[PDB]
Amino acid sequence: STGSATTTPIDSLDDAYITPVQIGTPAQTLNLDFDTGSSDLWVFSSETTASEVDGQTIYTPSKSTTAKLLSGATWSISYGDGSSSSGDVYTDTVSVGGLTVTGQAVESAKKVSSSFTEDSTIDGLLGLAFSTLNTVSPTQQKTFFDNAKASLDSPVFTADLGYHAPGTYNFGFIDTTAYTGSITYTAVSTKQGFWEWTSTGYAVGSGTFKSTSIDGIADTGTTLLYLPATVVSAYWAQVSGAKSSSSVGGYVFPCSATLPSFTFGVGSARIVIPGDYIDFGPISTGSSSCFGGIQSSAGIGINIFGDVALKAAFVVFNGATTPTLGFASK
Ligand SMILES: O[C@H]1C[C@H]2CC[C@@H](C1)N2Cc1ccccc1
Numbered sequence: 001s002t003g004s005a006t007t008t009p010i011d012s013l014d015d016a017y018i019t020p021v022q023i024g025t026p027a028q029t030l031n032l033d034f035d036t037g038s039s040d041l042w043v044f045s046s047e048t049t050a051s052e053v054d055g056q057t058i059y060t061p062s063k064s065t066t067a068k069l070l071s072g073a074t075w076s077i078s079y080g081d082g083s084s085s086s087g088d089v090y091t092d093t094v095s096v097g098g099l100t101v102t103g104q105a106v107e108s109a110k111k112v113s114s115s116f117t118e119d120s121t122i123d124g125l126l127g128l129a130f131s132t133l134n135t136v137s138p139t140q141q142k143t144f145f146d147n148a149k150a151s152l153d154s155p156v157f158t159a160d161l162g163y164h165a166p167g168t169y170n171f172g173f174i175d176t177t178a179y180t181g182s183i184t185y186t187a188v189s190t191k192q193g194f195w196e197w198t199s200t201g202y203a204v205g206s207g208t209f210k211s212t213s214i215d216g217i218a219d220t221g222t223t224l225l226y227l228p229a230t231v232v233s234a235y236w237a238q239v240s241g242a243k244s245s246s247s248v249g250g251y252v253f254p255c256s257a258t259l260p261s262f263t264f265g266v267g268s269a270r271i272v273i274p275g276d277y278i279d280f281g282p283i284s285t286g287s288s289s290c291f292g293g294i295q296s297s298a299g300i301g302i303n304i305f306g307d308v309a310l311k312a313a314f315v316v317f318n319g320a321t322t323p324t325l326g327f328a329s330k
Contacts, residue, residue: 001151002172003099007034007161010121013280014307015223017161018121019169022095023106024064030057030123034169035221036159036195036317037304039133039143040077041094042085042107043124044116052112055120059108067092067106075107075135080222080300085112089136094144096126099171101148105134105141125221128157128317133193145171145319155319159220160330161311163277179314179328184269188323192302194219195317197325199305200267202227204235205260209270216303218315218325224280225262225273226297226304235262235294242292248283251292255282262294264309266327273312 007017018031023043030043044053046060061067067090076086087110094104109116109124116122127134131142149155152172160178161167168178189196194217201211214227232251236242238260242253253259259275278293293308316326 001099001148002153002170003095003097003148004168004170005097006166007169008166009162009164010119012164014161014164014311016119016122017167017220017307019096019126021126023059024061024092025066026064027095028057028059028064030059031121032124032126033122033221034126034128034159035219036128037217037219037221038077038079038125039127039129039131039193040075040107040135041105041124041126041144042075042077042087042109044112045087045108047087048109049111052117054117057123059106059124061090061092061106061108064092066102070105070136070139073105073136073139073141075137077135080304081115083113083115085109085116087111089141096144096171097169099148099152101144104144104147105136107136128220129195130190130193132190148172149319157317157319159310159315159317161220161307163274163311167311174316179330181329182269183314183316183326183328184266185316185318185324185326186266188325190323194302195323195325200265202231202265203263203270204238207238209263209265211265214264214303216297216305218310218317219304219306220310222304222306223308224304224306225294225308226300226306227294228303229296229298232294232296235260236292244296245289248289248291250295252283252289253292255288255290257290264305269327271309271313271327271329273309277308277312
């Protein structure tokens with residue numbers, strides 16, 4: 001089997017991408033944030049505290065003839081940015097882009113944090129990291145991809161995120177028309193539960209490539225590119241007037257600037273992020289200070305190749321017995 005679904009930016013900045021997901025019988029379609037940095041499929045629901053729902057579409061398990069309470073199971077997740085949610089668990093039929101999994105754990109939120117409530121476009125998350133990170137207790141549950149894998153034509157999914165435009169998540173096949181050149185594959189460590197890999201270096205604009213190992217994660221659920229402070233300083237030094245602002249929370253730059261590209265290495269291959277992908281717009285409406293799309297990871301503990309980086313590539317998440325990542329230009 002295969003599946004193919006379009007993923008759409010939630011706003012004009014590409015802050016996140018939403019993909020329609022069919023849950024239950026008859027289908028209830030919710031727009032979920034596909035997140036290769038986490039491993040829970042959770043949704044706003046009829047059980048979510050009413051004051052914490054503001055415009056999201058909810059899953060109502062009592063209206064699904066295939067929903068079953070997973071008795072005794074609870075979940076609770078804290079993300080890298082401090083956002084959180086928790087609740088109980090149903091199993092139900094879940095379909096993405098024509099690919100159907102029966103008995104998928106659908107984690108129903110009883111509580112969500114302010115960033116989730118404020119995101120009226122996001123009805124939940126669909127985790128695509130390794131199932132070892134799934135938070136369901138006392139019986140850990142598998143991700144949608146893990147449940148689908150054995151049925152797929154090939155045990156892979158691909159992320160093709162658009163710049164200020166829709167893109168595609170495919171399951172079970174690699175669309176050879178969706179990228180240019182060749183796909184370069186690179187080793188993955190699953191030791192932390194992430195799609196963790198080592199970039200071979202970087203360049204700023206037309207500058208020389210610096211060969212240096214940068215361990216990080218491929219994370220579709222993170223908006224920006226978070227890299228070591230040395231790398232980030234080297235980038236922003238090429239933008240007149242750019243500076244790190246403690247009050248804003250990262251590097252800002254004059255909105256009048258033209259940003260240089262940023263290149264990262266995948267083995268001997270190179271992925272070029274155009275400068276415009278690094279502009280996240282005014283820090284507040286009407287401001288001439290703009291927020292940068294490349295930020296320091298120093299306070300995180302891990303480097304994160306988020307959407308800024310991934311949207312410059314066609315990315316293969318190869319879930320074979322020994323997983324690997326592939327990157328192609330497009
Ligand atoms: O306060 C709420 C949560 C965040 C921050 C501002 C706005 C509403 N949301 C933008 C956003 C959505 C998805 C990913 C990244 C950023």
